[PDB]
Amino acid sequence: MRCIGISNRDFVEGVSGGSWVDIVLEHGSCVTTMAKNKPTLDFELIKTEAKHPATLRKYCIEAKLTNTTTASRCPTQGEPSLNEEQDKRFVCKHSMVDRGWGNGCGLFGKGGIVTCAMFTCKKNMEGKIVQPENLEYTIVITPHSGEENAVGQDTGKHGKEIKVTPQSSITEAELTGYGTVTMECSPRTGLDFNEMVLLQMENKAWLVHRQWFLDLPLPWLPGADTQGSNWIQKETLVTFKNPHAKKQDVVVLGSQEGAMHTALTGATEIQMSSGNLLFTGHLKCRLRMDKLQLKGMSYSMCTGKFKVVKEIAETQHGTIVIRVQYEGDGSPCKIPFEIMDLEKRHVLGRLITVNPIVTEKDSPVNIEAEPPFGDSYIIIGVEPGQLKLSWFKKGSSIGQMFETTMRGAKRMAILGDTAWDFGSLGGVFTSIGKALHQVFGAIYGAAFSGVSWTMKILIGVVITWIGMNSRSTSLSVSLVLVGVVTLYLGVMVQA
Amino acid sequence: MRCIGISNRDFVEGVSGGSWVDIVLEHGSCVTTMAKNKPTLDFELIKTEAKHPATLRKYCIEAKLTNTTTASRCPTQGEPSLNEEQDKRFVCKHSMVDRGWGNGCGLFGKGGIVTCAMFTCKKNMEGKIVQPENLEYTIVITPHSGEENAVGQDTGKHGKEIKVTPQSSITEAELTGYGTVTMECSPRTGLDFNEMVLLQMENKAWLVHRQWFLDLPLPWLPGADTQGSNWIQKETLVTFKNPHAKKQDVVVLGSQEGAMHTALTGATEIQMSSGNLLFTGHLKCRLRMDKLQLKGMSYSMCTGKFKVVKEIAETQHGTIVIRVQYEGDGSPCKIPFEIMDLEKRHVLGRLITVNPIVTEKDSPVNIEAEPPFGDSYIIIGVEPGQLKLSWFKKGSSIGQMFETTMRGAKRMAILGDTAWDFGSLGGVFTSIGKALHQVFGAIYGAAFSGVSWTMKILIGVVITWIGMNSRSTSLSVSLVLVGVVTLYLGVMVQA
Amino acid sequence: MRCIGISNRDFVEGVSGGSWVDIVLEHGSCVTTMAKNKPTLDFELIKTEAKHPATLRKYCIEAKLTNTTTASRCPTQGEPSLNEEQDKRFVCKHSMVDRGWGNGCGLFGKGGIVTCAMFTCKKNMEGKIVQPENLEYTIVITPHSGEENAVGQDTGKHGKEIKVTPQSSITEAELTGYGTVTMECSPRTGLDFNEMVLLQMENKAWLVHRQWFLDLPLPWLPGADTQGSNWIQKETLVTFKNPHAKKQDVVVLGSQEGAMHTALTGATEIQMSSGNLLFTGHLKCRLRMDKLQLKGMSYSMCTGKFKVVKEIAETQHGTIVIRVQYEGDGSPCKIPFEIMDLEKRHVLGRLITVNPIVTEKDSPVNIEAEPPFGDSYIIIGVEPGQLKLSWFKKGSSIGQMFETTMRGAKRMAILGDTAWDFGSLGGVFTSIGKALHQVFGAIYGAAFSGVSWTMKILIGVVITWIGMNSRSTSLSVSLVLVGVVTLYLGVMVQA
Amino acid sequence: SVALVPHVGMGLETRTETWMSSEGAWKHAQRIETWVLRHPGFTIMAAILAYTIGTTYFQRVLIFILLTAVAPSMT
Amino acid sequence: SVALVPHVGMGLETRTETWMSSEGAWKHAQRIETWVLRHPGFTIMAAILAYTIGTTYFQRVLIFILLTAVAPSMT
Amino acid sequence: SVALVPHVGMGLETRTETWMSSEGAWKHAQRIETWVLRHPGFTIMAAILAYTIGTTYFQRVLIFILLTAVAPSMT
Numbered sequence A, B, C: 001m002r003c004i005g006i007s008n009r010d011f012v013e014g015v016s017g018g019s020w021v022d023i024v025l026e027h028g029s030c031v032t033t034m035a036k037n038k039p040t041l042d043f044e045l046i047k048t049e050a051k052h053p054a055t056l057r058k059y060c061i062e063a064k065l066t067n068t069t070t071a072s073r074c075p076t077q078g079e080p081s082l083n084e085e086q087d088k089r090f091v092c093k094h095s096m097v098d099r100g101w102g103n104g105c106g107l108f109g110k111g112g113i114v115t116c117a118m119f120t121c122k123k124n125m126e127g128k129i130v131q132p133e134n135l136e137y138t139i140v141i142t143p144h145s146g147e148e149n150a151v152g153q154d155t156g157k158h159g160k161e162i163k164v165t166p167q168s169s170i171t172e173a174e175l176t177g178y179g180t181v182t183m184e185c186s187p188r189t190g191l192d193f194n195e196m197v198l199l200q201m202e203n204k205a206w207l208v209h210r211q212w213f214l215d216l217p218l219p220w221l222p223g224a225d226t227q228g229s230n231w232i233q234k235e236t237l238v239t240f241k242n243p244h245a246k247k248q249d250v251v252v253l254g255s256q257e258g259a260m261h262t263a264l265t266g267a268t269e270i271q272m273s274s275g276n277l278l279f280t281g282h283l284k285c286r287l288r289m290d291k292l293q294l295k296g297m298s299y300s301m302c303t304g305k306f307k308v309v310k311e312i313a314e315t316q317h318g319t320i321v322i323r324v325q326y327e328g329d330g331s332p333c334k335i336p337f338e339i340m341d342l343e344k345r346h347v348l349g350r351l352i353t354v355n356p357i358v359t360e361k362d363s364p365v366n367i368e369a370e371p372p373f374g375d376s377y378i379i380i381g382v383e384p385g386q387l388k389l390s391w392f393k394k395g396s397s398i399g400q401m402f403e404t405t406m407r408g409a410k411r412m413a414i415l416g417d418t419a420w421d422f423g424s425l426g427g428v429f430t431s432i433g434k435a436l437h438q439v440f441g442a443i444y445g446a447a448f449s450g451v452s453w454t455m456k457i458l459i460g461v462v463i464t465w466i467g468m469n470s471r472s473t474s475l476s477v478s479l480v481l482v483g484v485v486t487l488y489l490g491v492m493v494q495a
Numbered sequence D, E, F: 001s002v003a004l005v006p007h008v009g010m011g012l013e014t015r016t017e018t019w020m021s022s023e024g025a026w027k028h029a030q031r032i033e034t035w036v037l038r039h040p041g042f043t044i045m046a047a048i049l050a051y052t053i054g055t056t057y058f059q060r061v062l063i064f065i066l067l068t069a070v071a072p073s074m075t
């Protein structure tokens, strides 16, 4: 029940002929899966670890200068020479300075001048890479079970956490009383590692684009370097001054920690202090329901009286959760639960905590259900003393449809074609849509790479105007669709 | 003899009816003035102090957070509040976090969350301001005496140093043997302080625009605060991260010294360690030559031999210098210096060190002269032992005219509408041009302020093309001229 | 008489009002000057010296690679690192090799590889520059004097040597018995040593263009190095090999001595081992004959027999030289010499050794004369024993005019506009011709710089064709003239 | 500087909030607004140039927006 | 941040070398060149949009240049 | 190599013979002739191309000569 209380919750209903459903698990989100006569598990992706990283490159964000020396050459006589120019750890620069009888030359022209200074780094911005093989994922599966303190407990109690790695395609969890749950997760198709860099800087880390990190305009070492002294591109972190063509000097150009923090705008943050922990991204899994059981299956109905120990509370997703305690005999029995209309003729509600059971007499099982829109009615227990509770739900079916469409669109914006197999059950139309989305997304991503959201909005407005002012209806409609999609992506991007 | 060896030397010839000439002295430049009956003088603006600076802001470039406190209320329950929200030395922000039974609230919504942390500065910038009446300009006047060590000398006692302030703007300098020179300057119309800030970093200083300093996006203190603890834009130096909707916290953004160095591009660097010293800018002065006489005009021609002790050398202006020594009698005597053709029938060049004289026999004297572009001969002395020195000049009058025109254009580009005072002697054309330049420069600056050189080049190209294809011939010519001027300015800007 | 038998001999006849004649002295050429009532003199520029050279650049023409190391990195993770890459004394390159489980890396692909080697110079050529004021020209002036061994005497025993330097514009040579000869040379406008480099490789030297020297693609050091180890572009003298995308290697290219000999094809050799004295170029001189009385005019005449001891010999320029022996009395007397017709009625010769005298009566005297085309007779001595020696010129006045025109054209080709100063008095026609030649040569040298003679001939043919097949008669004439001049220059160049 | 090249449009974003998303969302717009406020003269010139160059009102508005956005940017 | 307002068109420039003048002279051009190299997809789309929106060739070129220069800039 | 880019058109020639003037006067033409002898195929193709890009016998001859002279000398 760990999903009860999460705003990014998703409900996955139904399995395929093989009794499997493929789901996508995002960090900060969890998926509630239910199927006819199945234990209704909650899935959340809680950890992503990277092991055995290789330092791709090192950068200098803070350097100092020492041993500043200079040499000069009389005009027309070539350039000056310093011995420091042989050592690559000295930053040298050639300029020209006025020369004449006053300053010691026999000629009156621009003479050569060279300034050098030892370049020593003070602070680093090491960046690492990992192969997908060392890409362990931690997932926690929680059966609902209506346990007393399991309604929103994220500590992991009552749930089993499985580790998903590329080594094993199959992950097995034995849920006590519920059977076994099999996960076929694709850790290699989630975050596209080996084109991303794990960037560490002063006890902070970020997950960054590999090319963008290799293009950073800072002094850097190969990453296989050991001496740490042959910094290349040191000129990006130094300044040479020749104000009036009389003298040349060198300064070290100050720390770049704030500049790098500004440059890391749009990149997600990660923990590299201990173990390279990531808490962003998704994971596509195929969930097998074959060996899942209902814990209360083969129990009798509870014929005793029930009491409400925690009043009905409505969740962010149109469901309600109530806690009831059983005061009757036959303690291991299954709770009679129904959501009916005000006339008590139809069963209007849908139960998420399917097959609620009283495991122990004095144990407050809490149940979740999805009431209909309006004046649904909740019945707990059997006729002699059954609880007789009324509920109203605010929204409407049309509003729910609009919210669902927006949620699907946002999933298609966060994820690419990977959004197409979020709750897929085989399906040929799903495959066709995924392929079409793959092609269209490749084109769109190639056309919109490296662009901010304001630029995307500008381009969307331009394209929509072009479509609106198009003489051909087909081209006009296509351009309007492209512009609307671009406007939506610009509005939703950079989150 | 001090302007020799400086690439930015200017020549001012002639005075007005009043025996004065307007000149503009720049820090990195030297001015030599010549009049019909006056000694040649060299002028250099060497120093520009700013006294009694006052701070107006103390921007923070590196801070830290210590005391992080948090408060969340409940969904539907309004916003939480912390005691630190009223403490101006704490940085605060409100967010929303998922709430429910698992969190201990009991309503399943987004509950307000506010986190604060104490803000402490570690490094800051002091934007000092100096009122315009505390500026002091130091101008060195050195006459073309001909001393052996006077050529290119930058620290000799041959010249005289005059201090110029907005109060004592008119000063007089006694030049031993050359009368007195009166300088009537206008320091109030130079750098135009009261619109500028003296920005001081850890060990470096800049002269920056006051509005640009006031608009900087860092946290600042009023400048009179002894205790600090009331920084204004603390939010610009911290980041509040709320990944997903579970928790909120705040971290500092890292040292901004490098970012401020990057932002300080385009501002001339200054010195502020041992006083506020500005080796940049210009000063307009009116030079009174009336009490200025040539030394030794009542002397006889030497009538003896000379020996060249320093070979004739050409400066990067078209003038030549030479050091000769006298072995003859009547040592305090005029030196017979001429630049003629091979047959000694025409005077081809002129003397820049006018009235060369020998004061002490065993004291070499170095003369400067401007020879013609072709081949010329320097004749020093008279028939017995007279030395004739061949010299060739590699330029031409057309090239010299082009260089003079380009130098004037560059002076206009730097000293906008003040270049019309550089060597003026009054006049109606000069005044009309100065007024027209003032009007056009005001209009141009209104339309090009804040624009980079690349943008100026783009705008100039656009304006030039518009003028090129324009119906009106007068409008076409005017627009093409404006675009050409803009293109030249963009080519010459940011030096 | 030093000038007889050179094949590059110019006869300068006459002087201007002032008794000065312009001449240009070439190292391979020689000038004989004749004027009314003045001795015939021979001028030969025999030596040009450059003193106090400054080394501009040193190039490496042979090198050896040692200390070859290599490092490789695994594919898709960074670049390899070598400590030796820290030192600029090593030549380093980065390449890509194939990597896989066979090479010891975890993954397959292109891995980075770096090869290093120490670059040591074995043989280098040094480029030295000289200031024009440091040049010294050695001119030998030899009066004819008809001495026994003065004909073609390269020893200079009879002639006087004068050193021409930029320090003194007037050079005086006292010829015993002939007065004093004054020369005002211009050793500044001849060879332009400010644009030239004195290059030596090993026991050889050349005078090369400074820009061509600076553009040579060889590893080089500044003239001020003092270590000879930090060579700038060592990649030009080495080659890295990666034949099959594995095992990158580096080798040294080999001695560039022969390649540099080929590169120096169009340069002129010089001497650099014994004081870098170069026997090439020309020196423009103004010769003054004011104080050059004829020798031995007080002697009366020779009354005695003359015996021919060396028969008349034709010279390459149409002058005959005869050596005679005086057998009579009155030893210091004038030799009665004349070239007359058969009847001895008309004087038709022109004595070049003016006033031939006999000094010792045992030393033979050498007499040079210019006979006319056709038949002529040399008359020696008084009637008793008078010699009547017939001679036949075997030429023509028209052919002589054609030869003179060709010689002048070839001097224009070699000397440029300086040819107008050869044997030139002060004339308006010469001045206008020299100015026009200067303008046309300024255009032509700009248009035809850096091209070979074959290219010049092709361009001349093209221009001649364009001019001749042109409708305009003025354009046709101008283009045909330009093409013919270009063709002549291409035919007459590369010597 | 590095700050001139942020990590905004790299296509690696997830449902997790990025480093300085809230801060860096409207900072460019705020900077352009402040620049236009501080330099009205260039805004008038850009408007006039857009009107002259552009033939249609759409072209004129687009050019004006592009010029106004690029002016502070290229600095 | 502060680096995005780099005291460029403030006037006040004299005949003395300014702070980081040589670097800042061409840093923006280098950045645009690198961005165009790394994002060829946007450049083609900008070229197509400039061709479509602008009628005359001068308008098309101006629009394409402005779009290319403002694309990385909006950051 | 330095063997290329010789010291030919430097304008410093005097009446004195240069380093390898007599030897190097005709070497370029000699090696062009040897190349044309060894590669008749390219000469025929160059002639055909020159005729195709013609409109005048002068143009044909000039183009053919330039092509035949530049082929042995590139890379």
Ligand SMILES: *[C@@H]1O[C@H](CO)[C@@H](O)[C@H](O)[C@H]1NC(C)=O
Residues within 6 Å of the ligand: A066, A067, A118
């Ligand atoms: C730099 O200077 C220090 C003295 O402060 C000296 O000990 C050191 O050897 C020098 N290093 C180099 C590379 O010159």
Ligand SMILES: *[C@@H]1O[C@H](CO)[C@@H](O)[C@H](O)[C@H]1NC(C)=O
Residues within 6 Å of the ligand: B066, B067, B118
């Ligand atoms: C901040 O925390 C420190 C403990 O490290 C405490 O001593 C101090 O009083 C606190 N200051 C506040 C909360 O203002």
Ligand SMILES: *[C@@H]1O[C@H](CO)[C@@H](O)[C@H](O)[C@H]1NC(C)=O
Residues within 6 Å of the ligand: C066, C067, C118
């Ligand atoms: C180069 O190799 C030689 C021989 O192995 C060795 O003595 C020398 O120290 C080496 N030098 C360097 C710089 O590695």
